[PDB]
Amino acid sequence: SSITENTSWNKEFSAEAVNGVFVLCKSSSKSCATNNLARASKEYLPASTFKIPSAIIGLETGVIKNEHQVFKWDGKPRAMKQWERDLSLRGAIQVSAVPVFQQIAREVGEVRMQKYLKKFSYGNQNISGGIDKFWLEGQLRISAVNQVEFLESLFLNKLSASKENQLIVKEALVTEAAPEYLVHSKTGFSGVGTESNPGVAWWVGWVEKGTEVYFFAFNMDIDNENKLPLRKSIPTKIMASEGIIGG
Amino acid sequence: SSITENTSWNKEFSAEAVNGVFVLCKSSSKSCATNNLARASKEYLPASTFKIPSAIIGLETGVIKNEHQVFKWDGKPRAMKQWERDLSLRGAIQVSAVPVFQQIAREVGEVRMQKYLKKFSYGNQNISGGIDKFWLEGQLRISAVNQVEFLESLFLNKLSASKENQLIVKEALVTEAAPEYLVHSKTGFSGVGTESNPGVAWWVGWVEKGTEVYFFAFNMDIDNENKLPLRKSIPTKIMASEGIIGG
Ligand SMILES: *C(=O)[C@@H]([C@@H]1NC(C(=O)O)=C(S[C@@H]2CN[C@@H](C(=O)N(C)C)C2)[C@@H]1C)[C@@H](C)O
Ligand SMILES: *C(=O)[C@@H]([C@@H]1NC(C(=O)O)=C(S[C@@H]2CN[C@@H](C(=O)N(C)C)C2)[C@@H]1C)[C@@H](C)O
Numbered sequence: 001s002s003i004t005e006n007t008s009w010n011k012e013f014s015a016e017a018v019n020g021v022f023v024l025c026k027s028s029s030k031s032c033a034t035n036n037l038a039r040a041s042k043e044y045l046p047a048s049t050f051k052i053p054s055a056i057i058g059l060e061t062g063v064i065k066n067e068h069q070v071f072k073w074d075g076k077p078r079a080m081k082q083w084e085r086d087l088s089l090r091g092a093i094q095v096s097a098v099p100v101f102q103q104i105a106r107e108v109g110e111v112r113m114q115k116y117l118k119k120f121s122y123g124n125q126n127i128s129g130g131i132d133k134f135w136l137e138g139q140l141r142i143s144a145v146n147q148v149e150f151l152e153s154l155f156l157n158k159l160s161a162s163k164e165n166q167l168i169v170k171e172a173l174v175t176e177a178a179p180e181y182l183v184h185s186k187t188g189f190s191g192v193g194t195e196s197n198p199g200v201a202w203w204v205g206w207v208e209k210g211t212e213v214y215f216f217a218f219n220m221d222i223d224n225e226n227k228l229p230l231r232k233s234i235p236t237k238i239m240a241s242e243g244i245i246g247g
Numbered sequence: 248s249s250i251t252e253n254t255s256w257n258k259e260f261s262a263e264a265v266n267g268v269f270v271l272c273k274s275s276s277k278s279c280a281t282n283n284l285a286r287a288s289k290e291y292l293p294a295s296t297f298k299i300p301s302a303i304i305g306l307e308t309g310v311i312k313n314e315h316q317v318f319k320w321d322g323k324p325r326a327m328k329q330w331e332r333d334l335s336l337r338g339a340i341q342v343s344a345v346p347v348f349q350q351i352a353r354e355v356g357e358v359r360m361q362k363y364l365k366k367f368s369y370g371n372q373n374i375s376g377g378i379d380k381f382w383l384e385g386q387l388r389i390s391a392v393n394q395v396e397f398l399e400s401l402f403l404n405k406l407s408a409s410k411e412n413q414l415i416v417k418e419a420l421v422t423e424a425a426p427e428y429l430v431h432s433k434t435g436f437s438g439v440g441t442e443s444n445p446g447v448a449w450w451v452g453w454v455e456k457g458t459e460v461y462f463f464a465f466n467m468d469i470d471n472e473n474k475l476p477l478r479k480s481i482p483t484k485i486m487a488s489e490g491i492i493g494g
Binding site: 067085087088094156163164168170171174175176177179180182208210 | 314332333334410414417421424429430457458
């Protein structure tokens, strides 16, 4: 990757009082821009952004049968009422259905999971702490620049998985469609943590706009869920200002 | 297929004085509804809806290299200024760029084109009238019911083409995304014909909403370009009233 620190976006962060980073790459990870070089490479819990590799792994191992898979609710009281119904793959991704991806991880298992994270060069690749908890509460960490490299590889069909599985997950990540562009994205929020050691909120993805592609990763410190809306609005304003999406 | 004629949508057509048909199927073509059974099976020129099979055929023959193929603008005047730029596959479909699709048809050739439309069971499979004009001015015709059957095969990956190429075209047809659904669609419009021999406007697609799928095909007589907006608003109004899309 090739990254250059910026000052143009700082006011989008200091107007809202946020400590975080945005990484934005035009065409490829050979042209990235960021407001904060050091934080662009610091690794944080992926939280629900780990549903992107885990759905790819779920498909590649056969645990997710194909793009038509339905994830059927068993009837076990779920932590969220939005999790209490049958979901499609896109649906389980959208509402970050925790029990759905916990079951995928247990069916995948430790060995295969370790193997696919090494092939994908995903973060510190540390999955200790429990096979169905490592991305939520365990030791896995990944940086904003590594997220971008991972998304670009998915975008190019370069991950070690069939092209068909990569295409299935990219379609499942569409979140905004317009005549000139498609936005593929995924949020994450690790929780509030403390005020002294805050959690992290994320928003990573890519925009295909005409013949161009823009990759992006955003993360921020968050100690109050009421600050959750800035995880999308800061990056959205930045991208709207570069003429990438409508915002 | 299995289709039931209905009267609860006729008000949408009569209020705008349009003569047309809407075919809407839930889950599969075994469960279709329509306002007009007879017109639902009548065959019309496909016009730009023909970009769907044409994109799949271009990919399958290798004329279109992969999903990142760019269709470069040579700088010479085109019939519409929206076609006057380099275009991605989604971009070329969205603006139904004629010259891009004429060039694709010329490289696929008559023989392969006939073979694939026999494989796809696409309408009357008559490609006479010029290898680059048949779907716009030639003898090719296809009904609303046949469009639904074809889209359902594409949805299930049952067309005789790789799953990867079918998946690429499904994602290029995405036109609306919302947390609970994606809409995949494609417009069509043959020309105004006459007051007595009207042209035809289309809107075909499918909606993935949660774990459900709804396929749709809408066509109407049109003798004036100003009536073109109805081709999306009648069907949108009908789907919104059934609770499928949020409008
Ligand atoms: C994954 O990160 C967790 C998951 N992801 C997020 C996300 O939007 O980043 C949610 S946020 C949570 C539900 N709605 C939020 C709200 O109250 N706001 C103020 C917007 C709180 C969810 C926590 C996955 C492990 O559950
Ligand atoms: C293909 O059917 C013709 C093509 N399709 C359409 C269509 O939308 O039905 C268009 S005309 C319509 C108004 N002009 C277009 C544009 O303004 N949009 C991008 C909204 C849409 C065109 C006639 C094809 C052969 O070109």
